[PDB]
Amino acid sequence: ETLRVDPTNDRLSALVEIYRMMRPGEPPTREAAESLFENLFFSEDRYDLSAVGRMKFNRSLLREEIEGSGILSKDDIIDVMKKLIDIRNGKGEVDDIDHLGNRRIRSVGEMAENQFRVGLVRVERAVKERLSLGDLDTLMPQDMINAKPI
Amino acid sequence: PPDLRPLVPLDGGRFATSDLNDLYRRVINRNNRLKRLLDLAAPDIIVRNEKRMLQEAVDALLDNGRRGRAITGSNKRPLKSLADMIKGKQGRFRQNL
Amino acid sequence: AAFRSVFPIQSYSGNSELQYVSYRLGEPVFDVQECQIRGVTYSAPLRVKLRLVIYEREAPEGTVKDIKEQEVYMGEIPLMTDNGTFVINGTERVIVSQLHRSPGVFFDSDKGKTHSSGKVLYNARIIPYRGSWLDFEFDPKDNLFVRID
Amino acid sequence: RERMGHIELASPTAHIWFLKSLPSRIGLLLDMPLRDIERVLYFESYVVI
Amino acid sequence: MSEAPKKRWYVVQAFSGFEGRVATSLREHIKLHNMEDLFGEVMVPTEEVVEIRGGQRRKSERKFFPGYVLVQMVMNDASWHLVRSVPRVMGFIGGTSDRPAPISDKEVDAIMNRLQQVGDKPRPKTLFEPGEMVRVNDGPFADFNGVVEEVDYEKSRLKVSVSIFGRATPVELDFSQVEKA
DNA sequence: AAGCTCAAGTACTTAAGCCTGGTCATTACTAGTACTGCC
DNA sequence: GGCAGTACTAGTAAAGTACTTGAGCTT
RNA sequence: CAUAAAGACCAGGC
């Protein structure tokens, strides 16, 4: 009944609506509607659930292994929503918010990393253009990288 | 009033003035333009370009923010209007009381 | 662990491969006692080893080369005193650790339906650190919705 | 300080307190739209009811 | 496209003194579409700097319209929406705050003609001395003038009548020494 | 067809004293001009 | 000596209220 | 007698 009130019918109009909700006026292009949704929950440069958060994420779904990637996958959210339906029907109970398996201390070095990854995603866009601004192979010291956005 | 807006320097090459010094200087430069450019004495169906500039000049004395704010270079804050000193759009109503 | 997200860069007609070795800090500015008695900012530059190679496809000129620089200056991060405090401009600084809810999935009671009655509903909320939100809530019409950002 | 001067404006202008306010003083008494026509005529290019 | 596109223009109410790099920032933000898609031409009536020359009197005024950009782009209604999306622009101009009304091209060229029109009547053109009409700039009779009454192309001389002391003084001068009326 | 009220939808709201501390930066990008090096 | 490149420097990019309004239901 | 701006944010007392 969510599908019946769903206006979209395929992958394309879903990406059009996901761009259009993130200013409800227009469809962007062919390419930016893909790149924005890939930069919502499936790319480290805009969405990093850092590598501890995968380990805490696996215990919320009773997974066996604890290692994995930082960004989410297409199999995780469906398995979460199954547990949402199961808690709605009556089986199972709520989870503990304040338990320390969920309530985690973030260290000072990890905070410096989380204030350095902001400059990394800008300086990657710097080295993209300064790959083309280099003459032949002089782009190591300064013609590649800037210390201003970091 | 003349002495209500002084023009003294702060220290060296910097200044501390009111935000009314940038707004009363515009309304007067958008006043005689409709009088003598525009020497007509026309039907009112012709002229557009001046009251779009003069009304734009007096709106910054009226209100900034209800359609379009008035900002300065490297400043994403509206110019402190005469109503904005009373109602405190920038949060200075929490500073007046 | 954050360096290795920006090294594979793939430009069409460039064929660039950037491989990493290690980071080594350079020299500091002064010691731990001149940052209080003086106006020492103590901005230690961060220099990083790099290994890049180029295979250009624009026009064959017959000249190819691989010039390698040992250290390149990127960023100005402060360092740590022998106890564990920082300095940036003039003063001593300590960053407090952060404790909040996990980057995962949760199942609380309800939110949003405090205006109406809001009888039985269950819902999920995810807290990321950067990006957009992702919620999955219900309505009195028994339909599952989504909230992004 | 006490003495005043006045600026002769050739064309008169509006007071936006009487315009963007929801109880429109020139929309209720004088039967125009209270919000719509004010965002149609004043700043824009509709001419000399 | 199946139907031929028809490009139109609009007017962009922005800040005064804040306009030319808003056009440059239209080039910045709306970069990288490999085309010739939507933009036809940008029109910048202001200059990014100012001239030392201003009004002759402080009573005398300007016909300039600072902060009013004119951009060509199809939606139909495009080039005030996506020009306010470039920052330091006051609003959205025309029919309503989401939908401008279209104007013709000749009205746009007339808005350019309001820029091109200058204040050419405080009535001076001098470039002129008591003779009628030339400009001598050499020797004794510099900053004076007259008429070459007898032209000598073979001798390369011009017999110019200088009105000094209220009296004509016909003197023969070179082509490089004078400027022809 | 006119119209009359009703309900959901929407935007907007104002955040219970005063007091000093220290600090921190007041803008970094574009355009024109002037200076210097090379042909 | 003249022209072009570039660097320096001065303008300049939570949980509620009211209130609106769209729609469903009658003379 | 005149000068130390304005504002933001944080910490602190009760």
DSSP per-residue letters across chain B: -TTTS---BSSTT-B---TTTTTHHHHTTTTHHHHHSS-----TTS--TTHHHHHHHHHHHH-SSSS----BTTB-S----TTHHHH-TTSTHHHH-
**Interatomic CA distance for residues D7 and B26, integer angstroms:** 12
Task: Please say whether the beta carbons of B55 and B61 come within 8 A.
Answer: no
Q: Residue A31 CA to H10 C1' — how many Å? A: 43
Q: How many CA atoms lie within 13 A of B97 on its CB side?
A: 6
Number of Cβ atoms within 10 Å of the Cβ of E140: 10
Who contacts D41 (Cβ-Cβ below 8 Å, separation ≥6)?
none
Beta strands of A14-144 (E only): which ranges? 104-106
B10 touches strand F (CB under 7 A): no
Place of tokens 């965002």: D39
B18 touches strand H (CB under 7 A): no
Distance (Å, whole) CA C132 – CA C148: 6
D46 touches B at CB < 8 Å = no
Length of chain A: 150
* φ/ψ (deg, to 5) at C49: -70, 140
**What amino acid is encoded at C10 in this protein?**
Q
d(CA B3, CA B1): 6
Identity of the residue numbered A62: L
Q: Cα–Cα–Cα angle for E163, E164, E169, nearest 5°? A: 60
Experimental method: cryo-EM
Backbone angles phi, psi at A41, to 5 degrees: -135, 10
Cα separation, E181 vs E179, whole angstroms: 7
E51-60: Cβ within 8 A, 24+ apart: E55/E119, E56/E119, E56/E122, E57/E122, E59/B32, E60/E119, E60/E122
Rounded distance in angstroms from the CA atom of residue B57 to the C1' atom of nucleotide H2 = 37
Through-space separation of residue C111 CA and nucleotide G15 C1' in angstroms = 11
Beta carbons of C106 and C126 less than 8 angstroms apart: yes
List the structure tokens of C90.
């003039």
Whether residue E14 contacts residue E88, with contact meaning beta carbons closer than 8 Å, is answered with yes
For residue A94, what is the DSSP state? P
Strands (E), E80-147: none
Q: With residue A140 as reference, give the H or E element that holds it.
A: none
DSSP reduced 3-state for A56 = helix
Classify A54 as helix, strand or coil: helix
Widest distance between CA atoms in chain C: 78
Angle subtended at Cα E42 by Cα E39 and Cα E44, rounded to the nearest 5 degrees: 165
C-alpha closest to that of D48 among B48, E107, B44, B51: B44
Contact E42, E23 (CB under 8 A): yes
Three-state DSSP class for E132? Answer: coil
Per-residue flag: B41 CB under 7 A of strand H: no
Residue E18 near residue E47 (C-beta atoms within 8 A):
no
A23 CB inside 7 Å of strand F: no
Assigned token pair, C34? 């001149």
**Is E120 exposed, middle or buried, given 0-12, 13-18 or 19+ CB atoms closer than 10 A?**
exposed
Beta strands in E10-50 (DSSP E): 12-13, 42-43
Beta bridge partners of C53: C17
Q: Collapsing DSSP states into helix, strand and coil, what is residue C134?
A: strand
Q: Angle formed by the axes of helices A11-21 and A32-41, to 10°?
A: 70
Confirm if B22 and B61 have CB atoms less than 8 A apart: no
C-alpha to C-alpha distance for A79 and A81, rounded to whole angstroms: 6
3-state helix, strand, coil split of chain A in percent (to 5) is: 45, 0, 55
Query: Rounded to an integer, what distance in angstroms lies between the CA atom of residue C142 and that of residue C148?
Result: 20
Which of D13, D22, D24 has the most B C-beta neighbours within 10 Å, making it the best mutation to test the interface with B?
D13
DSSP conformation class of C11: -
CA-based radius of gyration for chain D = 15
Distance of CA A37 to the CA centre of its chain: 9
Rounded to the nearest 5 degrees, what angle is found at the Cα of E161, between the Cα atoms of E157 and E166? 160
Q: Which residues contact A125 (CB under 8 A, 6 or more apart)?
A: none
56-95 of chain B touching strand H, CB 7 A cut-off: 90-92, 95
Helical segments of chain C, H only: 34-37
From the list A95, A61, A59, the residue with the least C-alpha distance to A80 is A61
For residue C42, give the amino acid letter.
Y
D13 Cβ under 8 Å from any chain B Cβ: yes
Closest partner residue to E91 among B33, B49, B67, by Cβ?
B67
Q: How many CA atoms lie within 13 A of C136 on its CB side?
A: 18
Classify burial at E80, counting beta carbons within 10 Å of its beta carbon; exposed 0-12, middle 13-18, buried 19 or more: buried
Resolution (angstroms) stands at: 9.8
Count other Cβ atoms within 10 Å, centred on residue E1.
Answer: 4
Q: Are A44 and A71 in contact (CB under 8 A)?
A: yes
Peptide bond before residue E36 is cis, with ω within 30 degrees of 0: yes
Residue in chain A lying closest to C3 (CA): A120
Q: Which residue has the tokens 């000399």?
A: D48
Only one residue has tokens 């910045």, namely: E28
Of E37, C105, E121, B38, the C-alpha closest to A79 is C105
Q: Which phi and psi (to 5°) does residue C134 adopt?
A: -155, 105
